[PDB]
Amino acid sequence: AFFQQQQLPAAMADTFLEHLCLLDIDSEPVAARSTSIIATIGPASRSVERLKEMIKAGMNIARLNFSHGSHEYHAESIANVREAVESFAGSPLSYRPVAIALDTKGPGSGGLSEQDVRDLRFGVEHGVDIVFASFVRKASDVAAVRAALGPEGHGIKIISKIENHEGVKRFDEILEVSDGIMVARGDLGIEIPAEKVFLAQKMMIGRCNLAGKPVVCATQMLESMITKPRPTRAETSDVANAVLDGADCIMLSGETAKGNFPVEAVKMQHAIAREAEAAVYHRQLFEELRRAAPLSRDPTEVTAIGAVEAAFKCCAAAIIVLTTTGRSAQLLSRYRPRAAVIAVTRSAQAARQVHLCRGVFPLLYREPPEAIWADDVDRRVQFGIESGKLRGFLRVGDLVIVVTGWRPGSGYTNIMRVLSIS
Amino acid sequence: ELGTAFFQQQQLPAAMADTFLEHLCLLDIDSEPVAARSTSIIATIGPASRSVERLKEMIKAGMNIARLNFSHGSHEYHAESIANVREAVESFAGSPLSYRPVAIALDTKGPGPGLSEQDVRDLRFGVEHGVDIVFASFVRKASDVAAVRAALGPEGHGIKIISKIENHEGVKRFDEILEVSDGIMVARGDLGIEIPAEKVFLAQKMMIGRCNLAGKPVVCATQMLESMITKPRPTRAETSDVANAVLDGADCIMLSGETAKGNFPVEAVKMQHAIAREAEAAVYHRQLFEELRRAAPLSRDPTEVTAIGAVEAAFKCCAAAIIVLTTTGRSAQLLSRYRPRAAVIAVTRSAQAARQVHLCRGVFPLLYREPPEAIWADDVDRRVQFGIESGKLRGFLRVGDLVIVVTGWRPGSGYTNIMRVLSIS
Amino acid sequence: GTAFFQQQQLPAAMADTFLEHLCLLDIDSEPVAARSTSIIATIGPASRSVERLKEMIKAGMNIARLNFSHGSHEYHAESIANVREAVESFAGSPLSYRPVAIALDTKGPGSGPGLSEQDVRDLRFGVEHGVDIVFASFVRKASDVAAVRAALGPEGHGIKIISKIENHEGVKRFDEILEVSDGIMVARGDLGIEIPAEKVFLAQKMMIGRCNLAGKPVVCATQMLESMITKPRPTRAETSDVANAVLDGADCIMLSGETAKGNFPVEAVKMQHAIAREAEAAVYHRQLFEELRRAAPLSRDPTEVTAIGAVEAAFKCCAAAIIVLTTTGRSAQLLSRYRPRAAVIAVTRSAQAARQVHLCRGVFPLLYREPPEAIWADDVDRRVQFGIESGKLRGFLRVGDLVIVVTGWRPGSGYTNIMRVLSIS
Amino acid sequence: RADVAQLTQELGTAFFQQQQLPAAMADTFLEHLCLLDIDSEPVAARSTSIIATIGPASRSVERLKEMIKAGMNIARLNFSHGSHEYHAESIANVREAVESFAGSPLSYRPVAIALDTKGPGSGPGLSEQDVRDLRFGVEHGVDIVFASFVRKASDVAAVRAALGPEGHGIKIISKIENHEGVKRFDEILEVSDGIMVARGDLGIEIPAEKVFLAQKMMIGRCNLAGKPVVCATQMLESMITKPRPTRAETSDVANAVLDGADCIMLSGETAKGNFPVEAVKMQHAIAREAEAAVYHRQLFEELRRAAPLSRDPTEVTAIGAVEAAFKCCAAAIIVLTTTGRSAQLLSRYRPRAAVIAVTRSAQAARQVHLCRGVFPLLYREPPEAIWADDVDRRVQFGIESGKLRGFLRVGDLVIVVTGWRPGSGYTNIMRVLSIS
């Protein structure tokens, strides 16, 4: 029965053709949904009660579109998101962190506009986790956004939006200096021929997967759901194909910001992503990611590949990782394990930001410290297990891979352990 | 010999990649498609696309198959639609550069437990009006196909039956349905109501894979460019859907309300044409051909053996085309199953086979009507040169190009056993 | 039949990994195919008798090597005459006649920088006596090959030059030597003295791989069955060495003292024949063909394009043979480079080409002696039928087998362009 | 280039020219062959063990010391010749030569003692002489038994029964010497600790031209099972009378190592030949060259794909450690082992990194020579009061011996494999450590 669920017969196939032939509509997904959902906040999704329903439906990142509304409007949106998120903090083992992302207006006819400098400063002052930088055309555009965030905003992630021919052509230099990329298909589909957008999307997703950096697929994914309760056949296909391409995040714009069915749009993306993740051909995917990733003398990099290899060998239910900045969880995520990467962190910001990496489930550790560091480590590992059992990731008898470091502080991950649950 | 510019077009750097990941990374928006569009476009005929003048524009835009939806309209209405399609098609008989055969497909209303009374009458109408294809609605088991086959009476056994998979039972009994059908249509509209909407992509990808493995045509249908019923440009999800259906391995892509009742039927055909061309160049032939090769069982049928040898030869020299002589379309279909990058120019004396080969990806039919030569080998050479001269006229070929020529050792269907490498003079 | 798929290591050949392939090797799986790796026997006092040479031809000797390091021109002329007398004693039965090449192995440069004066005299002797191949000793650079070519003069243009790599400089300048040579010999005797003995296997495997990639013949030579000079059976290391040279990809295997001066020259040839047959069935064609196909560059040469198409077609139907008409042996060589499992039966009128094609693995030469038919297409058909009748007589073919037939569109060398699937009747 | 560029800048182009690294990074087996370089020197320690047969030519304590220095890892006693008194003196001479180097524990080399039985002869099962010889082996503390002419699983059960309750730790390596042994191979391997391809008798029992098929098949199946396989007989035969081997003999040794043999053997070459030490030196030289020429890229992928999924933490830690070692070009994998099992599970994935096995068991240290790439270190220190400190001391002993023998240098990365509690069967931890 275990080997009939989550497309396991299709995953064991020797060729991609055989894998496609073995896909079964009756094979139910069992793993937790790995691809994060970014929902744009607007009139249709601004109330605290509506936001609680969207968090329950699967929203992981709240997007504020600074192309519309005043700073006062966005500050109220941020406050409503935080109020809805903290209404579930009473149960720490099931609490779900939600990242706040600021999408800039852009340069327009102009480098960095004066409105963008003011909006970026607003973001730092209001503690946003991510910036979706509009119309990035070169590496210097990223440096300008980084400078406008100042010294108080060093920790904010910059996701560069590729929206035109120049951004596509200078992609490598942009990715090198960015934390991740957004395939902004709306403007891209106007700037380049509409029939070429799929080539740009597939290329950028592939290069981001190669680099181990987050990639977001955005715009018109479930467009008809702005007015209709069910999407079209092309829309469900689009969401499934973005997940199959290798997108870490999928986004909703008007579907959540102004549409009549914002919660239903989030539920639909959740349902499709789960089905598409089970249909991923891990046999060739892991081999290609493994082969393409360069040799490394960094112990976090070395422990990550060893842990993902160990997880596949035993069909581990999860990889529990201790992370300060989210980096150790990101290096596990780049190898696309089938096992959930449960990231136990004390940093509330890192817990929100790791939603950018596919298959990373953040757990914000709010338990008292232990005097002995070794006891403190084991306690964070046990917290990971208890929250995993509560959320359905783990059961007694399961095997897990535990990834820790040899000394406190970020940058010292070097240990992988095989642990039997209970 | 060919130049650096040649190897930068039609995603050739991405096609030469050693891994699928590298192939994706090398896809270039500046790499222009050069080959002719190989995925056929099926357009549904209705009030928005019924006039002879409108049909001429749709033929010019790229329509290869005209679909008549028997769920609406009378026999008199559909007979007028058929006559208008044939009039628009025959208006280009004077120009060899513009003439293109167009298949006529009858989509049945559907079942009740088995074949309905109206379906029996509509199938009979199809035989009487010389339709080429039947899109059989709600096929659930092999006996449903046998009923449609029996209804195609004594005169209609040459009509192709494309079974529409629209429900859970059709998906579950897929192998037995495909075995007795000529091809499959992934009818996503009803399938998306019968099974959870989020599972349709699994059924589509599975059916396309199994049809590619069997070497039988597969059509992807419904809501591909839905928003173009009222808007002049499609959404980002719609262009993605068309591209992904072509990348999945669909032989045909379809337009329903977009052409039957929408405000932009010609623009919807142009959009599918443009996306299919881009997606065909992005196909990863290196692994695709190896997997089609490995999955296909060993064969002692000379047509099947010649076809794989010809596709291998075409890839080795970057052949501009594979010219094949075919009476039933079978030789062109067996070439098409290996997904060559070279166009398969099928020269035939059968008008029906010329229309029906539009079901197979990459087959470009040429109807030959010259009186037969007394010496058979001269008749063969005349048809081979007809294919070369038409290929030059349409832009597929130039002097100095290499073509692969597929023929048999004696006249009559079923004896293909020869593959020649010819230099265009 | 099930019995067919149990023989010639077919279960091991169908394996998905090389590890599974090794695990499926069966000592009870008997080889069925004809032995494809040629045996070169060095001629000497133990193998000069016309009666002894007839037994060696029957045992499997394909090339007779004359070592010009020993004996006078008078001695070698008598060796040539004895070989030709033994070879021609079987010419009364043209369907079973076996051509035998004569190769001249030069003395070498010695302490000198380039071509010695004795080598110039020996090379002219070879041209005057009609030798087919030259095994050029101690080739260190491309200019050494050019000097051998110049010493053969205008009359020795058709002689094949196989460069012997016997020292560190030859290994280091391998690419430039292979580019100008017709093939290579891994001369392990001197190589094992010039470089550390424990590194010879790396040089052998490297040179065989590069020759396989270039599609040029490679010979593995020296001490393969050394103990058989005095003992009737070889050691376990010796049989392993022969099997591994064949598995590495050697086109030819050689006997030196074993045939020139030993007590068991016929048995040494029989032993190499027996081992080579077993090792050829154990070749993992699934990965080998895929890698040869992938590594070979794209080509606009019709012989090159037809060869890959014909090898692909032969694998698709498990063809018993590929019958090829050739004037210079080039069409058979281009088939051979893809390492088909099917025997390459080469029909030629050139007695020299028939002898020289023994350098290419899996090429079985048939010398056609009939004067031409007035109609060229009938002359082509008669030769193809001669190929089939010889194949049936020798055990390569049976009624019901499938064969691939490779021919050209006009007479003369260089115009091969047709591949045909034929059923044996 | 991009997948090795940063590591090439760090370790240097000279690092990536040695030990056939350009050939190992090739995308196809054809390219791998084309890139083999005679100028690419082997850097790693020799990982295929050498078994030398002891006889009149190699019996003296002084001769045995030279053979230990030349590379002998296992001493074979052929019970087809000589009395129990003769073999007891051979055992005593081997132990005396081995212990003459015990003064330096960081460089001491353990040597296993193997008893090769006479066989059943005309009989159906275990002979009476075999029962007496097997009892002699237990009484004299032999580490391994090479059981002659094993034809079915019941033959190995009989050998195990004849070893009694005191010989439970002795490894049984079944010799496949005839058609029946080849045909019933799977049932024999299942109950044996390993296999020996006994080519001498096999080459008489089956056609000589088919022995290579049996050798390659058995080596492949043993590699798949993760059990030791020995290639034996006539490997360097001409060295019985000549100082240098033939071209076929060096080729045979190299091909046995390339096939996947854990051990290579010398019979008459050491037992009665004129050049026993030179024969050991030649096998050492060839094995080093052949190990560097192994195509790890496809080999590791095939061993991973063929090995079934496992819920055993030792099994899971071993594959994770070998994957980690390949990612950073680790100089070694240091493993703590009681029975040798954890080192054996690392060895089955054929890492390029040396598997330095630290053990307190003198028998396990001798027996791990059966597994390719396992370098045993016998730890003689008394236990620390705190178990975690005792573990750390053992790991440091592995690093210090590794630096002393040339396996490790400051700046190298090492993979350390340990367990969570004392006793055999609890290996579950993999650590990446930088050598200081």
Ligand SMILES: O=S(=O)(NCc1ccc(S(=O)(=O)c2cccc(O)c2)cc1)c1cc(O)c(O)cc1-c1ccc(O)cc1
């Ligand atoms: O899982 S993968 O290894 N799939 C590789 C893959 C994909 C396409 C092709 S193919 O050669 O395009 C092809 C298409 C149809 C039938 C065929 O026989 C072959 C061959 C191999 C993969 C590798 C990547 O690097 C990537 O970014 C995405 C995916 C992927 C994952 C799951 C899917 O369902 C599809 C693609």
Ligand SMILES: O=S(=O)(NCc1ccc(S(=O)(=O)c2cccc(O)c2)cc1)c1cc(O)c(O)cc1-c1ccc(O)cc1
């Ligand atoms: O080293 S390997 O990865 N090589 C695999 C391998 C071996 C042979 C072939 S092959 O297809 O026979 C080939 C391809 C190209 C050129 C040739 O001359 C031969 C393809 C791939 C290997 C993989 C295994 O899983 C294994 O158990 C053993 C060996 C191996 C051992 C000894 C050899 O001589 C060769 C390979």
Ligand SMILES: O=P(O)(O)OC[C@H]1O[C@](O)(COP(=O)(O)O)[C@@H](O)[C@@H]1O
């Ligand atoms: O993922 P990051 O940011 O590198 O953090 C991983 C770190 O977490 C730890 O496991 C625990 O460290 P802390 O005690 O500081 O929380 C470290 O040993 C390791 O370096």
Ligand SMILES: O=P(O)(O)OC[C@H]1O[C@](O)(COP(=O)(O)O)[C@@H](O)[C@@H]1O
């Ligand atoms: O594709 P089909 O229907 O099998 O037709 C292929 C047939 O066409 C030919 O190439 C030419 O035949 P005709 O001259 O009868 O048209 C035959 O040799 C071959 O058998």
Ligand SMILES: O=P(O)(O)OC[C@H]1O[C@](O)(COP(=O)(O)O)[C@@H](O)[C@@H]1O
């Ligand atoms: O392999 P080669 O030397 O190029 O010979 C191939 C030639 O043999 C043929 O098949 C037969 O030609 P001939 O009639 O001259 O023998 C030609 O069509 C072809 O060009």
Ligand SMILES: O=P(O)(O)OC[C@H]1O[C@](O)(COP(=O)(O)O)[C@@H](O)[C@@H]1O
């Ligand atoms: O390889 P084996 O025989 O299973 O031994 C591995 C064992 O060695 C250890 O690392 C250390 O154990 P000891 O302290 O008993 O020597 C254990 O944690 C582990 O179970």
Ligand SMILES: O=C([O-])C(=O)[O-]
């Ligand atoms: O800004 C965006 O997200 C776009 O243009 O698609």
Ligand SMILES: O=C([O-])C(=O)[O-]
């Ligand atoms: O009938 C159709 O085409 C459907 O249901 O999708």
Ligand SMILES: O=C([O-])C(=O)[O-]
């Ligand atoms: O010359 C040779 O044949 C040799 O040196 O091996």
Ligand SMILES: O=C([O-])C(=O)[O-]
């Ligand atoms: O007994 C043996 O060792 C043999 O036959 O090789």
Ligand SMILES: [K+]
């Ligand atoms: K914006």
Ligand SMILES: [K+]
């Ligand atoms: K209908």
Ligand SMILES: [K+]
């Ligand atoms: K010579």
Ligand SMILES: [K+]
């Ligand atoms: K014995």
Ligand SMILES: [Mg+2]
């Ligand atoms: Mg935009």
Ligand SMILES: [Mg+2]
């Ligand atoms: Mg329907």
